[PDB]
Design an enzyme around this catalytic site. Structure first.
Site, PDB file in Angstrom:
ATOM      1  CD1 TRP A   1     -54.430   0.018  97.095  1.00  0.00           C
ATOM      2  CD2 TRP A   1     -53.863  -0.443  94.987  1.00  0.00           C
ATOM      3  NE1 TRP A   1     -55.177  -1.111  96.616  1.00  0.00           N
ATOM      4  CE2 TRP A   1     -54.827  -1.363  95.379  1.00  0.00           C
ATOM      5  CE3 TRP A   1     -53.336  -0.513  93.693  1.00  0.00           C
ATOM      6  CZ2 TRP A   1     -55.304  -2.376  94.535  1.00  0.00           C
ATOM      7  CZ3 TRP A   1     -53.822  -1.534  92.853  1.00  0.00           C
ATOM      8  CH2 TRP A   1     -54.760  -2.421  93.255  1.00  0.00           C
ATOM      9  CD  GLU A   2     -51.775   3.556 103.220  1.00  0.00           C
ATOM     10  OE1 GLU A   2     -52.286   3.327 104.301  1.00  0.00           O
ATOM     11  OE2 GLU A   2     -51.014   4.594 102.932  1.00  0.00           O
ATOM     12  CG  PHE A   3     -51.614  -2.186 102.236  1.00  0.00           C
ATOM     13  CD1 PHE A   3     -50.609  -1.216 102.303  1.00  0.00           C
ATOM     14  CD2 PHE A   3     -52.322  -2.522 103.380  1.00  0.00           C
ATOM     15  CE1 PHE A   3     -50.333  -0.578 103.503  1.00  0.00           C
ATOM     16  CE2 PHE A   3     -52.018  -1.904 104.581  1.00  0.00           C
ATOM     17  CZ  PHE A   3     -51.038  -0.930 104.629  1.00  0.00           C
TER      18      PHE A   3
ATOM     19  CB  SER B   1     -56.633   2.910  99.524  1.00  0.00           C
ATOM     20  OG  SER B   1     -55.361   3.542  99.599  1.00  0.00           O
TER      21      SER B   1
END
Ligand SMILES: CC(=O)N[C@@H]1[C@@H](O)[C@H](O[C@@H]2O[C@H](CO)[C@@H](O[C@@H]3O[C@H](CO)[C@@H](O[C@@H]4O[C@H](CO)[C@@H](O[C@@H]5O[C@H](CO)[C@@H](O[C@@H]6O[C@H](CO)[C@@H](O[C@@H]7O[C@H](CO)[C@@H](O[C@@H]8O[C@H](CO)[C@@H](O)[C@H](O)[C@H]8NC(C)=O)[C@H](O)[C@H]7NC(C)=O)[C@H](O)[C@H]6NC(C)=O)[C@H](O)[C@H]5NC(C)=O)[C@H](O)[C@H]4NC(C)=O)[C@H](O)[C@H]3NC(C)=O)[C@H](O)[C@H]2NC(C)=O)[C@@H](CO)O[C@H]1O
Length: 540
Positions: free
Chosen positions: A291-293, A255
């Site tokens: 998408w973290e985060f 991510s």
């Protein structure tokens, strides 16, 4: 008299529209998309007059024609649609045309049009369900699960899903862009090799061997162009034309690049590379963004910004615009989804009430609420509700749904998460009134593959016998097993807690259920997902 009957020459009959270079490790070199496959056929005439025109036919229709000038000939031509064709060579003159026996030729494309359907039997405890509730039933399949976990695409119980998500597609970039990959041994280096000569912020494939070249059921011949996970997923699409198969970009370790996408130069390059990826790999039906985060608090402690919310909304709008354009180019429906934190502190960094207009489904990750990352504050990792001993618990499924609903998210967008694994601790001690969750722990429980995490299959197979206590907390709607002598404590979903989530989805008119990760189930969890949402037993 008409010409003699030609004999098709022995020769390669397997051809591809998207060519795969068998001695390339960089993604730019590995795949070459053409507008058509280059095909070749040769022939000999053992008896007779060779005619004056030779033709190559596919299912009766001319693909090539030229003068017939001797007893042997060769034709090279282009075929722009995938599938299997009956090919003939005909020699013609003024008195007639004489056609060879047919030879099948195979023209490969990444929609799987050249493959037989991969329709495998249900394994373990999986039972057949019809997808007729209208609800999402989803699960993630992991690219690296084909090694130690030995869980390949022919083992997915695919008739029991609406959505199969593939974790994970990486975004190219080296130092400062994918530093979270340097925690997984050899992983960062692997991505740099795949991305050699390729711009950062474009997507690539993290393990090209697992994704495209490892031999797997149905794709074992040396000249099958697409093997690995992607070859089997193409054949799964032939068996299940309505299953949605989505590539998921991101996850815990991939991510970091999203945090740079406030630069629209980078964001636009990323979106264009997703478009190209879906044009290249036609079996995929959209994109999932994991998408973290936004805001940070993911794997990298140095990333995260107040800008991230705005960037996420922009990204979704531009992804939707690209997919809408691809959709009208192809006549297909493409989906845009995202896997998001279910913690309210993370939810309210994003305006999902705006982003939802770009998105088909929100996969609410209502799991990992608790676990061996915190040894002091124990709790149910995937519960629907707070437990009786702590009714103010922040991280529950209902609180994550309610945070979204309070922003103005429509209920039908929200897909609730179920866990096919437990998290747990060892050495739990100092707890009151026989509730182990009121104590503190000394470290992680011994995991199946990694510390602190246990596949559900192993919970059911090993930790529901002997000294292990089993308790169903009916307030929280959550099971847990506890071994008093060592203080091992494991929190997980089971068929009953999944049934409570499914009833809750139907009651609140939410969008369905999804799960992480499909390899760890023995069938009990996905069976309950299907039953609790109202899908009928059986097949269509
Ligand atoms: C609500 C709240 O606020 N609470 C907070 C919490 O949220 C928060 O915790 C975070 O919570 C998130 C959710 O809110 C959560 O994220 C999402 O949820 C999922 C679950 O939680 C999460 O899952 C993560 O996913 C990550 C990836 O992102 C996984 O990481 C993977 O880990 C694997 C280890 O098990 C790695 O594996 C290895 O893979 C390599 C490949 O690179 C492989 O190598 C191959 O090995 C074989 C050898 O056997 C070789 O093969 C040999 O050789 C030939 C060929 O060469 C073979 O053919 C042959 O078979 C073989 N033979 C032999 C014997 O030799 C081959 O060559 C090798 N290598 C290559 C490729 O060259 C290894 O084998 C693999 N090992 C194993 C054991 O499998 C894997 O690489 C790695 N993947 C990546 C991409 O990094 C985690 O495992 C996973 N965890 C779980 C629980 O499953 C998702 O990321 C998220 N999902 C979505 C949808 O978005 C967060 O994860 C969670 N994080 C934490 C910390 O938990 C907490 C914490 O902040 O805070 C609360 O507040």
């Amino acid at each position: 008299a008409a010409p003699g009957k030609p004999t098709i020459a022995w020769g390669n009959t397997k051809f591809a529209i998207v060519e795969v270079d068998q001695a390339a490790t960089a993604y730019n070199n590995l795949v070459k998309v053409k507008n058509a496959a280059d095909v070749s056929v040769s022939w000999n005439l053992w008896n007779g007059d060779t005619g004056t025109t030779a033709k190559v036919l596919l299912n009766g229709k001319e693909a090539w024609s030229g003068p017939s000038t001797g007893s042997s000939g060769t034709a090279n031509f282009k075929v722009n649609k995938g599938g299997r064709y009956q090919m003939q060579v005909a020699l013609c003159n003024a008195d007639g045309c004489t056609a060879s026996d047919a030879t099948e030729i195979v023209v490969a494309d990444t929609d799987g049009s050249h493959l037989a359907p991969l329709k495998e039997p249900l394994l373990e405890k999986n039972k057949p369900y019809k997808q007729n509730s209208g609800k999402v039933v989803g699960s993630y399949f992991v690219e690296w699960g084909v090694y130690g976990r030995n869980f390949t695409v022919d083992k997915i119980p695919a008739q029991n899903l609406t959505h199969l998500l593939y974790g994970f597609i990486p975004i190219c970039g080296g130092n400062g862009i994918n530093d979270s990959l340097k925690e997984i041994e050899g992983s960062f280096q692997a991505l740099q090799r795949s991305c050699q000569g390729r711009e950062d912020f474009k997507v690539s494939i993290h393990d090209p061997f697992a994704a495209l070249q490892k031999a797997q059921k149905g794709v074992t011949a040396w000249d099958d162009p697409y093997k690995g996970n992607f070859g089997q997923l193409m054949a799964l699409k032939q068996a299940h034309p309505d299953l949605k198969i989505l590539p998921s970009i991101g996850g815990w370790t991939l991510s970091d690049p999203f945090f740079f996408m406030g630069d629209k130069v980078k964001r636009d390059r990323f979106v264009g590379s997703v478009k190209e990826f879906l044009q290249t790999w036609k079996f995929f039906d959209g994109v999932d963004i994991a998408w973290e985060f936004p805001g940070g608090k993911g794997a990298n402690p140095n990333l995260g910004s107040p800008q991230d919310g705005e960037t996420y909304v922009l990204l979704m709008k531009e992804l939707r615009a690209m997919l809408d354009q691809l959709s009208v180019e192809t006549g297909r429906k493409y989906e845009l989804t995202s896997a998001i934190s279910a913690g309210k502190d993370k939810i309210d960094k994003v305006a999902y009430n705006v982003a939802q207009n770009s998105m088909d489904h929100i996969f609410l990750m209502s799991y990992d609420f608790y676990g061996a990352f915190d040894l002091k504050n124990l709790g149910h990792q995937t519960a629907l509700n707070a437990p009786a001993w702590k009714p103010d618990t922040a991280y529950t499924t209902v609180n994550g749904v309610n945070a979204l609903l309070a922003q103005g998210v429509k209920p039908g967008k929200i897909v609730v998460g179920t866990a096919m694994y437990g998290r747990g601790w060892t050495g739990v001690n100092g707890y009151q009134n026989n509730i182990p969750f009121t104590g503190t722990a000394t470290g992680p429980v011994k995991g199946t593959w990694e510390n602190g995490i246990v596949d559900y299959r192993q919970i059911a197979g090993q930790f529901m016998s002997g000294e292990w206590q089993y308790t169903y907390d009916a307030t929280a709607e959550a099971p847990y097993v506890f071994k008093p002598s060592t203080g091992d404590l494991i929190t997980f979903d089971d068929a009953r807690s999944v049934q409570a989530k499914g009833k809750y989805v139907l009651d609140k008119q939410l969008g369905g259920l999804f799960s992480w990760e499909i390899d760890a189930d023995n069938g009990d969890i996905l069976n309950s997902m299907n039953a609790s949402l109202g899908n009928s037993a059986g097949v269509q």
